[PDB]
Amino acid sequence: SLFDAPTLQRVTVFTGSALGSSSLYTQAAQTLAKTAVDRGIDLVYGGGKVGLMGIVADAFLESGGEAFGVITESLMKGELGHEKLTELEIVPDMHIRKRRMAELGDGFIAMPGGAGTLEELFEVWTWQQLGIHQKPVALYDVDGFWQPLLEMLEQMTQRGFIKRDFFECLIVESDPHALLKAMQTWTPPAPKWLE
Amino acid sequence: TLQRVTVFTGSALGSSSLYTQAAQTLAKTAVDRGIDLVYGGGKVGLMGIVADAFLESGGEAFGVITESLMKGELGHEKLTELEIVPDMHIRKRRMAELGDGFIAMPGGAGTLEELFEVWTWQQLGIHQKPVALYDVDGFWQPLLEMLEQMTQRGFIKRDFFECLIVESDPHALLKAMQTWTPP
């Protein structure tokens, strides 16, 4: 229906190819995967087998959900792709990879990661602002990991480079049930009233 | 050597005229070095400011813009050359091909997005070009603080974070770019 948000069938997850320095990030990813599958949401992600990327894909498969990785030729030649995925799309470059992860997902989540995770997050958020998609964008704030980013965006907003209304449409939860609940009920803000 | 530099900067002007001025001063400094501008082709915000400044100072400015943004009345019509491309990704492929290095002046989410793409791709060996942050009025300090924590939590190689250029003065910035070596 026209008044309804599309219902989330898949979520695209951005996260590190390292595990990072707390056991907690491995736990927290596992929990989200379980919650996701509980609501019949499947996973789209970058197709890796190590670090949090690997953790989250494995947790998804193990809870009995599905998992669609999208990976490049370069990465597949260097034999870095996960081998037991529901599907694994191999594409010529990093652009197409991001484009395809964004077409496949019904929403985006950023779990802890580094530069690459930021590359992906800001792109999809920018695109939301340009009207290229109207899918929700969320930060999984595991042990406050994303708090420094929020301080940075708050400062950018104050200096006038980001509209407060966009920044406030960013979902940030540390609880996974909350996170996905906000993603399901999310609607984009009316262009009619931005300020 | 550095002949063209790709600049990422905000589509708005920001709440203080300091940014406009720094953007102007940087363009002059780069023209004096013989360096031309490559950027996303807009006339609004600091994009417009920096492109005007390169032109008015005797230098050249090349824009790469999508068909959509052109249609949106955001394009600059008095550049040295303006390429029109299908989409955002071809636009970044081209800005990266044309650039010999990358500078991120103040901006928002659009700027962040371009910045992180080319930084990440430096980490992966896709290119070996300097990436620099023009730290006007400490604008990028909160970003460095975020990166510092990510490095302390295991998600960014310290080695790589240290190869990131950060400078508030434009003569220092361009010299840092000119003498930089890869990680």
Numbering used by the authors:
A (entry chain B): 3 to 197
B (entry chain A): 9 to 191
The authors write:
LOG produces active cytokinins via dephosphoribosylation, directly hydrolyzing the bond between N6-substituted bases and ribose 5′-monophosphates in cytokinin precursors such as iPRMP or trans-zeatin riboside 5′-monophosphate (tZRMP). Interestingly, C. glutamicum ATCC 13032 contains a gene product of Cg2612 that is annotated as a possible LDC (pfam03641) and a nucleotide-binding protein. Based on biochemical studies and structural comparison with other LOGs, we propose that Cg2612 functions as an LOG. On the other hand, EcCadA showed no phosphoribohydrolase activity with AMP as a substrate. These results confirm that Cg2612 belongs to the LOG family, and hereafter, we will represent Cg2612 as CgLOG.
Interestingly, among four monomers in the asymmetric unit, two monomers contain a phosphate ion at each active site. The central β-sheet which is formed by seven parallel β-strands is surrounded by eight α-helices. Dimerization of two polypeptides constitutes a pocket which serves as the active site, and the conserved “PGGXGTXXE” motif was found in the surface of the pocket, which will be described in detail later. In our current structure, one phosphate and one glycerol molecule are bound at the AMP binding site and these molecules mimic the stabilization of the phosphate moiety and the ribose ring, respectively. Two proposed catalytic residues, Arg99 and Glu122, are located in the vicinity of the bond to be hydrolyzed; a covalent bond between adenine-N9 and ribose-C1.
